[PDB]
Amino acid sequence: LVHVASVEKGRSYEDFQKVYNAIALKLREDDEYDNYIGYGPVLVRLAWHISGTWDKHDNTGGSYGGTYRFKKEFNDPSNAGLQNGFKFLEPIHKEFPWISSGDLFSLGGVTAVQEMQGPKIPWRCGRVDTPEDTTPDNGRLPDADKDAGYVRTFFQRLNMNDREVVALMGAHALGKTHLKNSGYEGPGGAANNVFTNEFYLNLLNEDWKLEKNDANNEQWDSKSGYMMLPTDYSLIQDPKYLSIVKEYANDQDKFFKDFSKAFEKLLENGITFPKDAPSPFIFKTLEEQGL
Numbered sequence: 001l002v003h004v005a006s007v008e009k010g011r012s013y014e015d016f017q018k019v020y021n022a023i024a025l026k027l028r029e030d031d032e033y034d035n036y037i038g039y040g041p042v043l044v045r046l047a048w049h050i051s052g053t054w055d056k057h058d059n060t061g062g063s064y065g066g067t068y069r070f071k072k073e074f075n076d077p078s079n080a081g082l083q084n085g086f087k088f089l090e091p092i093h094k095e096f097p098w099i100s101s102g103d104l105f106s107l108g109g110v111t112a113v114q115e116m117q118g119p120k121i122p123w124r125c126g127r128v129d130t131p132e133d134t135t136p137d138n139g140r141l142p143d144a145d146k147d148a149g150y151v152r153t154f155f156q157r158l159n160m161n162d163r164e165v166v167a168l169m170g171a172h173a174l175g176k177t178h179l180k181n182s183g184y185e186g187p188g189g190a191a192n193n194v195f196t197n198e199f200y201l202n203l204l205n206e207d208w209k210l211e212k213n214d215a216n217n218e219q220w221d222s223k224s225g226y227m228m229l230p231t232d233y234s235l236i237q238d239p240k241y242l243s244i245v246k247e248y249a250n251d252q253d254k255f256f257k258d259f260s261k262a263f264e265k266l267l268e269n270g271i272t273f274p275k276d277a278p279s280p281f282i283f284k285t286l287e288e289q290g291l
């Protein structure tokens, strides 16, 4: 496969900035979801799961085809609970029927991060919806019950190196695990709908204790009321990952700069951009626009 980026016919910066402004305004408004966490967390988890099925060996999966729209990928056990992020974005697609699915799912994520006071993520348009038979089979997204060797081996299929994996995993400060979705339960820190380096600081400063939960799975619990997945706790069991964790815990700007770069890379894997194509867009936030 080659998947060439094709701009939605006739659209420019300002059209895209209007879909962003509309996702951000609905984030403002539906602020009660998940005990007042808001939809920002489930929207960045949707943008990483439509991108994470990519395989570098044969160019299949990835954000291009918008294939989550199909039953097979939608009903994937690893995608439980994302139906909420889909439902949120659905009125927005009716308001802007020209944007592709891959471009909408992926800009949902960019919008959520920047509105949650995260860094600016450059975003590129051009994904083209592809047929139901391009839909990747289930089982390409990662297990939580595993160690640092699995994490490193997994992220190599998406060719992410160590620093990229540690920066990408800093998004687990956001939101929470939920027992009926994934067999895991609990939040990862205090500020779970603001984007900060809190995940690293909690991983280095809490007294974590291994316990089984109501699903019969293990997780790392702390006195404070927080949890960490086995795969999250892996980042301090590996000496290479641990020097990176410490760096971000001492420097939130360096974390913002590396998350920005790696999140964009994750959203654009498997896509070729012609150089006639527009430069990546930097969208303004509501606040920046006085809205």
Ligand code: HEM
Pocket: 041, 042, 044, 045, 048, 080, 081, 142, 143, 144, 151, 168, 169, 171, 172, 174, 175, 176, 177, 178, 179, 180, 181, 182, 183, 184, 231
């Ligand atoms: C080895 C890697 C990863 C594993 C095993 C993993 C697994 C999980 C699991 C089990 C949950 C809880 C789902 C639920 O019950 O609702 C979760 C939540 C979440 N994940 Fe990951 N994750 C990984 C990587 C990432 C990456 C790379 C990102 C983002 C760039 C990410 C973002 C999120 C977000 C934002 C949530 C919170 C969702 C919510 O509040 O509903 N994850 N993760």
